[PDB]
Design a protein around this ligand. Sequence first.
Ligand SMILES: CC(=O)O[C@@H]1[C@@H](C)O[C@@H](c2ccc3c(c2O)[C@H](O)[C@]24O[C@@]2(C3=O)[C@@]2(O)C(=O)C=C(C)C[C@@]2(O)C[C@@H]4O)C[C@H]1OC(=O)/C=C/C=C/C=C/C=C/C(=O)O
Ligand SMILES: CC(=O)O[C@@H]1[C@@H](C)O[C@@H](c2ccc3c(c2O)[C@H](O)[C@]24O[C@@]2(C3=O)[C@@]2(O)C(=O)C=C(C)C[C@@]2(O)C[C@@H]4O)C[C@H]1OC(=O)/C=C/C=C/C=C/C=C/C(=O)O
Ligand SMILES: [Ca+2]
Ligand SMILES: [Cl-]
Ligand SMILES: [Cl-]
Ligand SMILES: [Cl-]
Ligand SMILES: [Cl-]
Ligand SMILES: [Cl-]
Ligand SMILES: [Cl-]
Ligand SMILES: [Cl-]
Ligand SMILES: [Cl-]
Lengths: 232, 242
Amino acid sequence: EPVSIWMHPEPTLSRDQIVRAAVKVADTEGVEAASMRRVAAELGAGTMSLYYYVPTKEDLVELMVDEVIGETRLPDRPGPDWRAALTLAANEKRALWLRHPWLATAWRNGHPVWGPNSLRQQEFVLGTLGVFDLQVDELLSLIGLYNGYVESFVRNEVGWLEEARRTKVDMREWMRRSGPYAQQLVDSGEYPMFARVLAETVAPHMGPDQRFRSGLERLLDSIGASLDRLSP
Amino acid sequence: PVSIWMHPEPAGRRSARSHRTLSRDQIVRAAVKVADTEGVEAASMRRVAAELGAGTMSLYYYVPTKEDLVELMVDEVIGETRLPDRPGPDWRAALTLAANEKRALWLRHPWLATAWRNGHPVWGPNSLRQQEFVLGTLGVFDLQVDELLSLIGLYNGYVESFVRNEVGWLEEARRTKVDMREWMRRSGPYAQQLVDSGEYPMFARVLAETVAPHMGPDQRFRSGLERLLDSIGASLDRLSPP
Ligand SMILES: CC(=O)O[C@@H]1[C@@H](C)O[C@@H](c2ccc3c(c2O)[C@H](O)[C@]24O[C@@]2(C3=O)[C@@]2(O)C(=O)C=C(C)C[C@@]2(O)C[C@@H]4O)C[C@H]1OC(=O)/C=C/C=C/C=C/C=C/C(=O)O
Ligand SMILES: CC(=O)O[C@@H]1[C@@H](C)O[C@@H](c2ccc3c(c2O)[C@H](O)[C@]24O[C@@]2(C3=O)[C@@]2(O)C(=O)C=C(C)C[C@@]2(O)C[C@@H]4O)C[C@H]1OC(=O)/C=C/C=C/C=C/C=C/C(=O)O
Ligand SMILES: [Ca+2]
Ligand SMILES: [Cl-]
Ligand SMILES: [Cl-]
Ligand SMILES: [Cl-]
Ligand SMILES: [Cl-]
Ligand SMILES: [Cl-]
Ligand SMILES: [Cl-]
Ligand SMILES: [Cl-]
Ligand SMILES: [Cl-]
């Protein structure tokens, strides 16, 4: 039976060096550029000798994820103020993804990453609502609202940065250039919800940081409303 | 760069050595079939041309870049969703229908979970029509546009995360031969070592008390979706007191 990288003890070179060097490549070149042969060259080592520490590309990615999650700066305990605690975790996750853009898209597996940094972060996040009388699956559903918002926002933010390096058209410029088509769509009268969105939305005109915070505040109100009903 | 939705499409044309007339639609449809069977990376201009019995360069007359092709493919398959013109007066039932149609679509075309790496939205006609339906489900409540979009954000965040993870398991298992249920079996001993450490009590509680993972995929999706709809409902109430 193939053994989890987390159950697979590691014996000049080390697993951590290999992982950190891989991360440094992916940060600027993407995860596909962080091949073993590339990471080997970065460490002045022979490629075959890397496999002794990290048996596969798949395992390298999983190690890379857990390694970076270790960079977040969370207190030991979430404390009683769940809003502040989730805001703190939200801001840290956003900053982490923007430092490591590949996090938004590198993971195409189903299985979760059960390395020590991810488990430690999960304690903090799951613990934020431990002071309400929730069943586990109620808890996990509310935390899914939180993760859903943060990851969707930042995945899109990192999509725009990626897209703009290809096209040199960023979000603001994209909205400017799409205006004549948007008007054509509104004037057709076929998309009245869309027309309402365009006429009335505020979010796209704020900077990214206040747009993130303003969505977070609404997200947290949505969790608070559910808490009112579940644990009254 | 003119967007693909504004890029005027030339007349259908048959190259002298080809049996079939070439059009944008026929190229996108042939691309979708390739992506379904072999993934989006395999659907190079050449491969898609081979499926059509056409020369590679003649495709570029109809679709100028791979990215436009992908945007076209995304909009094409979204046309497959089966939604009525208007959502109707039951918002839970309407978002339930859209959730189940999106999940089935992503299961038919699993590259939808991963192939879109851009920031810009797809404003093709199939996407805009589905967006009207989805946005329309809460349009009758007294909601500011950005409260509406935050609530629809909850809906999409749930459906996409679930199905992205579902399709991930399927892809992962084609490589490893271990699906989710088997992965849970094989990970038992390690999970028990983590619990035994005493360093992860929330994790221990989760492993002890979670029900969802033990359900079959349809029941798990439904049961999460009901909980998501309960949260949207608590928000709808609280947004318009008393
Ligand atoms: C995320 C995203 O899609 O973000 C979009 C951004 C890139 O682009 C934003 C965008 C684009 C263009 C404009 C605007 C945008 O905000 C402006 O607001 C704008 O509307 C503009 C304008 O071009 C205007 O200038 C103009 O040129 C023409 C018109 C007719 C109106 C204006 O005159 C007035 C206003 O200036 C809107 C925003 O749309 C939304 O927020 C859409 C949200 C839709 C949620 C869909 C969920 C559906 C779920 C599902 O199917 O499961
Ligand atoms: C999505 C996912 O991660 O899905 C996981 C699935 C693949 O795997 C599920 C999983 C795995 C293993 C087992 C189980 C699982 O459910 C079982 O429930 C299990 O717990 C099992 C067992 O192996 C057991 O058999 C066993 O071998 C060992 C122990 C200690 C207990 C059992 O004896 C009893 C029980 O049968 C857990 C589930 O965890 C969750 O559902 C976790 C939700 C995590 C949310 C974290 C939010 C973090 C956010 C953030 O940091 O921003
Ligand atoms: Ca508030
Ligand atoms: Cl990447
Ligand atoms: Cl490699
Ligand atoms: Cl490998
Ligand atoms: Cl941008
Ligand atoms: Cl800002
Ligand atoms: Cl793919
Ligand atoms: Cl599975
Ligand atoms: Cl089922």
